[PDB]
Amino acid sequence: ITGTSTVGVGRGVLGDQKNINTTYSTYYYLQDNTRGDGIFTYDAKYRTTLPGSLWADADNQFFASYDAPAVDAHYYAGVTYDYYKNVHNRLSYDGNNAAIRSSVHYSQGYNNAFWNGSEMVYGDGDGQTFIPLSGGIDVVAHELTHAVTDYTAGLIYQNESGAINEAISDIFGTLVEFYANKNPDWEIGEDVYTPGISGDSLRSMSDPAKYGDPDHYSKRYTGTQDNGGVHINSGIINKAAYLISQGGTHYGVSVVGIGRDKLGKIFYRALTQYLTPTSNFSQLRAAAVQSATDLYGSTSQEVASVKQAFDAVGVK
């Protein structure tokens, strides 16, 4: 669409009011011209054909409940784009300001969200297990980070390389949650998961075992489900990343925390410079160590903590 950039107002999934960037041309569209080549949000109208219709609204006000997921998908994509640019100097997922597209209201009762290789897709949830998934900034940021990985390391979606791919998305989705200061934690999906139950989440980075995911290499899943456990074994890496950031003692191994910022710096460097499509956990450790070395020196604490963290989860 070609039109006039403007700002509208609406309410997100959780009922919070926010301003969003829109474009005016007869209708007001969810098209944000302020970031790279734009952020565009589409209505999939409960169908599975994609992307659907670019979101059009008559009055620049998005307070209808059908609007909620679109508002959040649109807003949180902006935040994520900001994170990457401000923090890592990366312009969009491709590093070249590629347009970011998302569709909401995908299918009916669909309890998931995903990056399909070209755009983001969000289900509305069945209302019991989930509410519309775009209401979780960690979810949005996890998905958009898959785009980042696709254009960089290109980690294949299966086995260890696939678990790394998943852990990368949880790590950065959590760093984005902290960046925006939106009730941050080391949990994944807490805001949209099981509305009826307080205190839970989909996955825990601080304690993966809490939901039955492995927190040590000796406990890894070796079967074939979930693409070889990409969503299970990511727990081992998630735990490592939490320790590097926060510190702690795990299985008798002590790790001094170096904080979130450095965690993000080290992981982003590993991702963009050292990982390859077939990298395994052991290769990830080597990459993380080389990155920290690059950034802080071989005899740094940073390096030391990265080592301790992997020893703690049993990754050699």
Q: Where on the chain is the footprint of Ca ion (CB under 5 A)? A: 138, 177, 185, 187, 193-194, 197, 200
Contact 155, 162 (CB under 8 A): yes
Tell which one of 26, 49, 59, 252 touches Mn ion (CB under 5 A): 59
Binding mask 145-174 toward Mn ion (x if CB under 5 A, else -) reads: ------------------------x-----
Binding residues for Ca(2+): 57, 59, 61, 138, 177, 183, 185, 187, 190, 193-194, 197, 200
The mark string for 83-122 relative to Mn ion (x by CB under 5 A, - otherwise) is ----------------------------------------
Of 143, 169, 137, nearest to 71 by C-alpha is: 137
Q: Which of 143, 160, 250, 302 is catalytic?
A: 143
Q: Is the dihedral of CA 95, 92, 238, 117 positive or negative?
A: negative
Binding site for Zn(2+), by residue number, is 142, 146, 166
SS3 assignment, position 22:
strand
Angstrom distance (rounded) from CA 298 to CA 107: 51
Cβ atoms of 8 and 61 within 8 Å: the answer is yes
Kindly state whether residue 16 participates in binding Mn ion, applying the rule CB under 5 A. no
Sign of CA dihedral 94, 97, 98, 101: positive
Residue nearest Ca ion (C-beta atom)? 194
Q: Are 125 and 196 in contact (CB under 8 A)?
A: no
Residue type at position 291: S
Partner in contact with 183, chosen from Ca ion, Mn ion, none, beta carbon below 5 to 8 Å by kind: Mn ion
Is residue 231 part of the annotated active site? The answer reads yes
Q: Assess 200 for contact with Mn ion (CB under 5 A).
A: no
Which one of the spans 53-61, 93-101, 128-136, 248-256 is the region binding Mn ion (CB under 5 A)? Answer: 53-61
Other beta carbons less than 10 A from residue 68's beta carbon: 24
The catalytic residues are: 143, 231
